[PDB]
Design a protein around this motif. Sequence first.
Motif, PDB file in Angstrom:
ATOM      1  N   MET A  60      -0.213   9.150   5.584  1.00  0.00           N
ATOM      2  CA  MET A  60       0.765  10.186   5.835  1.00  0.00           C
ATOM      3  C   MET A  60       2.062   9.974   5.056  1.00  0.00           C
ATOM      4  N   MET A  61       2.538   8.743   4.974  1.00  0.00           N
ATOM      5  CA  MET A  61       3.715   8.425   4.184  1.00  0.00           C
ATOM      6  C   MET A  61       3.472   8.683   2.702  1.00  0.00           C
ATOM      7  N   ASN A  62       2.306   8.309   2.210  1.00  0.00           N
ATOM      8  CA  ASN A  62       1.942   8.592   0.842  1.00  0.00           C
ATOM      9  C   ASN A  62       1.825  10.088   0.550  1.00  0.00           C
ATOM     10  N   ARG A  63       1.353  10.860   1.509  1.00  0.00           N
ATOM     11  CA  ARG A  63       1.304  12.301   1.347  1.00  0.00           C
ATOM     12  C   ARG A  63       2.700  12.921   1.196  1.00  0.00           C
ATOM     13  N   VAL A  64       3.672  12.465   1.965  1.00  0.00           N
ATOM     14  CA  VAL A  64       5.033  12.963   1.861  1.00  0.00           C
ATOM     15  C   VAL A  64       5.568  12.630   0.494  1.00  0.00           C
ATOM     16  N   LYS A  65       5.287  11.428   0.049  1.00  0.00           N
ATOM     17  CA  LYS A  65       5.692  11.030  -1.254  1.00  0.00           C
ATOM     18  C   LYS A  65       5.029  11.828  -2.387  1.00  0.00           C
ATOM     19  N   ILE A 112      11.189  12.382   7.431  1.00  0.00           N
ATOM     20  CA  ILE A 112       9.790  12.534   7.858  1.00  0.00           C
ATOM     21  C   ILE A 112       9.083  11.187   7.828  1.00  0.00           C
ATOM     22  N   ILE A 113       9.366  10.388   6.802  1.00  0.00           N
ATOM     23  CA  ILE A 113       8.745   9.071   6.712  1.00  0.00           C
ATOM     24  C   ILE A 113       9.222   8.178   7.847  1.00  0.00           C
ATOM     25  N   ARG A 114      10.489   8.263   8.224  1.00  0.00           N
ATOM     26  CA  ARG A 114      10.906   7.464   9.372  1.00  0.00           C
ATOM     27  C   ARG A 114      10.209   7.936  10.668  1.00  0.00           C
ATOM     28  N   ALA A 115       9.987   9.240  10.799  1.00  0.00           N
ATOM     29  CA  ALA A 115       9.236   9.744  11.952  1.00  0.00           C
ATOM     30  C   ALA A 115       7.830   9.171  11.987  1.00  0.00           C
ATOM     31  N   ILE A 116       7.230   8.930  10.824  1.00  0.00           N
ATOM     32  CA  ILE A 116       5.905   8.299  10.785  1.00  0.00           C
ATOM     33  C   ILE A 116       5.996   6.778  11.023  1.00  0.00           C
ATOM     34  N   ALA A 117       6.883   6.103  10.304  1.00  0.00           N
ATOM     35  CA  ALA A 117       6.914   4.643  10.276  1.00  0.00           C
ATOM     36  C   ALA A 117       7.523   4.071  11.543  1.00  0.00           C
ATOM     37  N   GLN A 118       8.475   4.793  12.130  1.00  0.00           N
ATOM     38  CA  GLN A 118       9.083   4.450  13.408  1.00  0.00           C
ATOM     39  C   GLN A 118       9.633   3.020  13.446  1.00  0.00           C
ATOM     40  N   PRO A 119      10.629   2.709  12.605  1.00  0.00           N
ATOM     41  CA  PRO A 119      11.219   1.369  12.677  1.00  0.00           C
ATOM     42  C   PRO A 119      11.890   1.156  14.022  1.00  0.00           C
ATOM     43  N   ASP A 120      11.805  -0.085  14.473  1.00  0.00           N
ATOM     44  CA  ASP A 120      12.319  -0.498  15.766  1.00  0.00           C
ATOM     45  C   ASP A 120      13.804  -0.835  15.708  1.00  0.00           C
ATOM     46  N   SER A 121      14.589  -0.126  14.898  1.00  0.00           N
ATOM     47  CA  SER A 121      16.012  -0.395  14.759  1.00  0.00           C
ATOM     48  C   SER A 121      16.794   0.908  14.669  1.00  0.00           C
ATOM     49  N   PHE A 122      18.069   0.813  15.020  1.00  0.00           N
ATOM     50  CA  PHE A 122      19.011   1.908  14.954  1.00  0.00           C
ATOM     51  C   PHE A 122      19.180   2.347  13.492  1.00  0.00           C
ATOM     52  N   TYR A 145      10.842  -4.102  11.314  1.00  0.00           N
ATOM     53  CA  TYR A 145       9.451  -4.058  10.865  1.00  0.00           C
ATOM     54  C   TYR A 145       8.502  -3.702  12.008  1.00  0.00           C
ATOM     55  N   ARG A 146       7.486  -2.897  11.702  1.00  0.00           N
ATOM     56  CA  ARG A 146       6.432  -2.559  12.660  1.00  0.00           C
ATOM     57  C   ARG A 146       5.152  -2.566  11.845  1.00  0.00           C
ATOM     58  N   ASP A 147       4.057  -3.050  12.404  1.00  0.00           N
ATOM     59  CA  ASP A 147       2.795  -2.953  11.689  1.00  0.00           C
ATOM     60  C   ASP A 147       2.290  -1.530  11.647  1.00  0.00           C
ATOM     61  N   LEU A 148       1.717  -1.154  10.521  1.00  0.00           N
ATOM     62  CA  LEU A 148       1.246   0.200  10.344  1.00  0.00           C
ATOM     63  C   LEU A 148      -0.234   0.391  10.161  1.00  0.00           C
ATOM     64  N   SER A 149      -0.751   1.474  10.695  1.00  0.00           N
ATOM     65  CA  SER A 149      -2.135   1.814  10.492  1.00  0.00           C
ATOM     66  C   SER A 149      -2.350   2.485   9.156  1.00  0.00           C
ATOM     67  N   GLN A 150      -3.597   2.572   8.718  1.00  0.00           N
ATOM     68  CA  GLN A 150      -3.924   3.248   7.479  1.00  0.00           C
ATOM     69  C   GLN A 150      -3.574   4.718   7.538  1.00  0.00           C
ATOM     70  N   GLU A 151      -3.764   5.338   8.692  1.00  0.00           N
ATOM     71  CA  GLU A 151      -3.377   6.725   8.844  1.00  0.00           C
ATOM     72  C   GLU A 151      -1.886   6.928   8.631  1.00  0.00           C
ATOM     73  N   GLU A 152      -1.087   6.027   9.145  1.00  0.00           N
ATOM     74  CA  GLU A 152       0.338   6.108   8.935  1.00  0.00           C
ATOM     75  C   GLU A 152       0.704   5.945   7.474  1.00  0.00           C
ATOM     76  N   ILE A 153       0.069   5.010   6.787  1.00  0.00           N
ATOM     77  CA  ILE A 153       0.301   4.821   5.366  1.00  0.00           C
ATOM     78  C   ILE A 153      -0.120   6.043   4.553  1.00  0.00           C
ATOM     79  N   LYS A 186       0.787  -1.220   0.000  1.00  0.00           N
ATOM     80  CA  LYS A 186       0.000   0.000   0.000  1.00  0.00           C
ATOM     81  C   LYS A 186       0.825   1.279   0.000  1.00  0.00           C
ATOM     82  N   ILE A 187       2.140   1.181   0.083  1.00  0.00           N
ATOM     83  CA  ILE A 187       2.998   2.355   0.067  1.00  0.00           C
ATOM     84  C   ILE A 187       3.622   2.556  -1.298  1.00  0.00           C
ATOM     85  N   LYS A 188       3.578   3.775  -1.785  1.00  0.00           N
ATOM     86  CA  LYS A 188       4.165   4.095  -3.066  1.00  0.00           C
ATOM     87  C   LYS A 188       5.653   3.874  -3.094  1.00  0.00           C
TER      88      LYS A 188
END
Lengths: 92, 92, 92, 92, 92, 92
Positions: free
Chosen positions: C20-25, C82-92, C10-18, A6-8
């Motif tokens: 927002m990521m698509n908007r940045v894109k 900005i996308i990492r701020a939204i997606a928030q991966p659980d890794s360094f 990996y972290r599961d994402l909500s539709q709102e998060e997706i 679902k991500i571009k």
Amino acid sequence: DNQHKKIKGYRDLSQEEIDMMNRVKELGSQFEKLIQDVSDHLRGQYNASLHNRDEITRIANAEPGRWLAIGKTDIQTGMMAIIRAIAQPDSF
Amino acid sequence: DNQHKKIKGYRDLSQEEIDMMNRVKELGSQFEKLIQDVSDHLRGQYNASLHNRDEITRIANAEPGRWLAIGKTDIQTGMMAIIRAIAQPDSF
Amino acid sequence: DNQHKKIKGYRDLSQEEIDMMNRVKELGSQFEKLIQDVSDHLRGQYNASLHNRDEITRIANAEPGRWLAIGKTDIQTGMMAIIRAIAQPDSF
Amino acid sequence: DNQHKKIKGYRDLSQEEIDMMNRVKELGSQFEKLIQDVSDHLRGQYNASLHNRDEITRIANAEPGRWLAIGKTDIQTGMMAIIRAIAQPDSF
Amino acid sequence: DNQHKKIKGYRDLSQEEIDMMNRVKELGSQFEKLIQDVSDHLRGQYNASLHNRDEITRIANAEPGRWLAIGKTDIQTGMMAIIRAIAQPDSF
Amino acid sequence: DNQHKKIKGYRDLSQEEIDMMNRVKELGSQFEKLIQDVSDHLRGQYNASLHNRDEITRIANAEPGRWLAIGKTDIQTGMMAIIRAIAQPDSF
């Protein structure tokens, strides 16, 4: 959910590509451990030097906590760029 | 020559500080090996994809060689900043 | 394949998060169009100015193609952060 | 005052150049709105997650406010570089 | 101690190389003086503008202390890169 | 034309602000002279070392022209940020 589809920019990845991305991440965790180690060294250096005003002023002028933070940010964005070179998203 | 004592900012260093700087450098050599590995993967990917115009266009649009170069520059300047946090030169 | 679940962080994402990521894109694609427009302006400026040595020297001294490239790299890494701020991966 | 003619690097600009600079700025205001939106999302995420220690620790480990700040700085310096590519000041 | 010979990447340097590194450092001290001067200007600007809410809001929206800090970091890492171009360490 | 009043973000400036911006620019011209000097040193170093394969390989591994270019870009964007801290445009 196949949320990534679902991500571009999504592109299907091979196992080799995933392994390479995981390797960058594992090397990053070694840098994270190193940065935590340097940060503890700095905390000790400051503690030992309390009451030695000249050395407290030397530490404040060297700004080592700031420089360590800059290094952490560069290591992490570098990892992100290498991973994008591997993953090759189809978007700007 | 004690050439370093001729450079502004010189500070005497402990063995622990030298070991920490060497550790950053050794971790960097692991990243350099990883980057060379990714670069070879890209060279192969391009070679395999020659004559497949759509895939050559995909690679050109993804700009993976550029992204790998950005990552290399960030890893190296990050190392430089962590080392300055350890070495703490007495200069701007 | 659920390939992303094979990548560390990996972290599961909500539709709102997706979204927002698509908007940045999508905002990024507008910047990509703008950058292509500026690049065409520069190509014209150079073409018109051929044979005018003083203006060719002015353009070379201003280095506008280099500055445009720096801007493109900053826009793209900014999007990535900005996308990492939204997606928030659980890794360094 | 024609204050700009008192600053080194001044160059006279065409309307097309001004329009292009204004376009970068208007696209930037859209990014500023997006960043404010992401920041509000983060504030909510933190509020909802208060008392859930594991999720508060997850957010602290992901450092999304820091990553958003990095993205803002990159977007803004990218805008500055594209504008310099348009305006082409006659100075280093 | 010849401590530098204990650090990986060490290279022997000529006097010309040392002079060039010292020159970058001396030019940097002029930038440090300039940055301190700008910082004092900002402190005054804020003090004068206390109680003028519209001007306090203008200053907060312009974020000049943040921009000055970004400039300081760029000047300092730029100095570090020019010095590495001179010193040419034999390491990644 | 008062062209600047046609650009978003315009703010009227005092003479002190203009002088400070000009000072950053003049200090930058000193860095530009220094960078040209380092670049000439590198050109000589390469010329002298032609036919000495081991030293040509050492120079290629040190990548001094790349590091000098990174330093130039950091000095210039640093100048841009200090000038924005002085000029304080009313835009993102």
